[PDB]
Design a protein around this ligand. Structure first.
Ligand SMILES: NC(=O)C1=CN([C@@H]2O[C@H](COP(=O)(O)OP(=O)(O)OC[C@H]3O[C@@H](n4cnc5c(N)ncnc54)[C@H](OP(=O)(O)O)[C@@H]3O)[C@@H](O)[C@H]2O)C=CC1
Length: 416
């Protein structure tokens, strides 16, 4: 289904749980500014190819818009608009002084050389320069897009801007050598475990010695397992990847699992474990469940079989709304998809703060600031959930849309 229309339907669905005027809802239904540009580069052969670029600024009531740039051959303007609309609420739920944005280029980066990729990155900046800036619109890395491209784009922006202001703050996720931030690799898992600890505290259960299962072993999942087995005494009993999964109640070492997966290409046939499939491992005797691999992994056909006390949605929407309804009545606490993994955007905000201030923090400072941000955001969502008797997703939507609506009213954009 059309991604932008799906985002609009979710906003309309959230509107019924709060007092929002119709004019503000119509304002939030459509992006404030959309830019479509031609991105021309010269290829290695010598010919000029024209690529289609996008940059969508959904809303900037609370501050400059924030969102990554995605390089995908199947990318569409509607998808970019939907992701920018989602980013608005993603930065609103954790109380960032940001609006929502998103960019994209319809390109297959697999077929571009490193010189062609640098040319594309610089041309995109040369084309969208008039709508981006450290206080206007801050891009970020996304699908098929990385810190190297961030460095190239930042250099192009600095060259155009003639070093008048802070050119590091125009983009985030860049290498440490040029305005980069510490804690950027482990941001999402750190935020996820902070929300998990807060959820356990709200449930009033001593979380040390409990069993956790993780779907996927990427940058998210592996670090989620490490940090669970790092500083809160959370016993890992199962991990998984695309190929398969393992489980053993005696205990698992995340570092030994990672090295075995790296030296063998997958976690399958891990020593001292019996291969258990992902769909079987989701239904496991665990006290914290943290799916962190893919989306749509918890559906109607498998929602009623889950037996965990806490589900932490580290992945981007791993639980369907009907599954949300099933898991809610069972008494299972869930963490909304765009609240659990907000550590990445929070640390991008921290990087932007360090760039504009010209002063850079340490790992401990970033971790502690993210601790405060995530705990406050989770408590704000959870109290709304227990006050309005609505699901966690609905409470997070109510909080974020309420913040954006209040900013819009204060600016005078809307009266009612
Ligand atoms: N900044 C972040 O890290 C953010 C992370 N997320 C989500 O976290 C997830 C992890 O991605 P990321 O952290 O970027 O790192 P990776 O993309 O490297 O992580 C992907 C992991 O998921 C596993 N996986 C893939 N397909 C399946 C499947 N069908 N069933 C089970 N496991 C599977 C992969 O196993 P294998 O190696 O065998 O393929 C791999 O371990 C993504 O879905 C992402 O959307 C959410 C918000 C942002």
């Amino acid at each position: 289904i059309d991604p932008f229309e799906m985002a609009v339907k979710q906003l309309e669905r959230a509107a019924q749980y709060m007092d929002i005027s119709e004019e503000a809802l119509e304002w939030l239904k459509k992006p404030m500014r959309i830019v479509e540009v031609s991105v021309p580069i010269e290829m290695d052969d010598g010919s000029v190819k024209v690529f289609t670029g996008f940059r969508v600024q959904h809303n900037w009531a609370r501050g400059p818009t924030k969102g990554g740039i995605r390089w995908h051959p199947a990318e569409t303007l509607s998808t970019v608009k939907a992701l920018a609309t989602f980013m608005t609420w993603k930065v609103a739920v954790v109380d960032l002084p940001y609006g929502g944005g998103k960019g994209g280029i319809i390109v297959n980066p697999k077929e571009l050389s490193e010189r062609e990729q640098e040319r594309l990155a610089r041309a995109y900046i040369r084309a969208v320069y008039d709508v981006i800036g450290p206080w206007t619109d801050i891009p970020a890395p996304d699908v098929y897009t990385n810190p190297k491209i961030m460095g190239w784009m930042m250099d192009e922006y600095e060259t155009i801007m003639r070093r008048k202001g802070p050119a590091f703050g125009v983009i985030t996720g860049k290498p440490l050598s040029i305005g980069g931030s510490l804690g950027r690799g482990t941001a999402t898992a750190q935020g996820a475990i902070f929300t998990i600890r807060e959820a356990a505290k709200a449930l009033g259960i001593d979380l040390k010695g409990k069993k956790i299962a993780v779907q996927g072993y990427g940058n998210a999942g592996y670090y989620t397992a490490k940090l669970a087995k790092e500083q809160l005494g959370m016993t890992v009993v199962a991990v998984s990847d695309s190929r398969g999964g393992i489980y053993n109640p005696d205990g698992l070492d995340p570092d030994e699992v990672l090295k075995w997966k790296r030296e063998h290409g997958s976690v399958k046939d891990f020593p001292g474990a019996t291969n258990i499939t992902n769909e079987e491992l989701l239904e496991l005797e665990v006290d914290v469940l943290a799916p962190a691999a893919i989306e749509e992994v918890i559906t109607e056909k498998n929602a009623d079989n889950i037996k965990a006390k806490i589900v932490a949605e580290v992945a981007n929407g791993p639980v369907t709304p009907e599954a949300d309804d099933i898991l809610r009545e069972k008494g299972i606490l869930q963490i909304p998809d765009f609240l659990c993994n907000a550590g990445g955007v929070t640390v991008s905000y921290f990087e932007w703060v360090q760039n504009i201030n010209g002063y850079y923090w340490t790992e401990e400072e970033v971790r502690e600031k993210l601790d405060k941000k995530m705990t406050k955001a989770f408590w704000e969502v959870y109290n709304t959930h227990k006050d309005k008797n609505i699901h966690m997703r609905d409470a997070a939507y109510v909080v974020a849309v309420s913040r954006v609506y209040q900013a819009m009213k204060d600016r005078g954009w809307v009266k009612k």
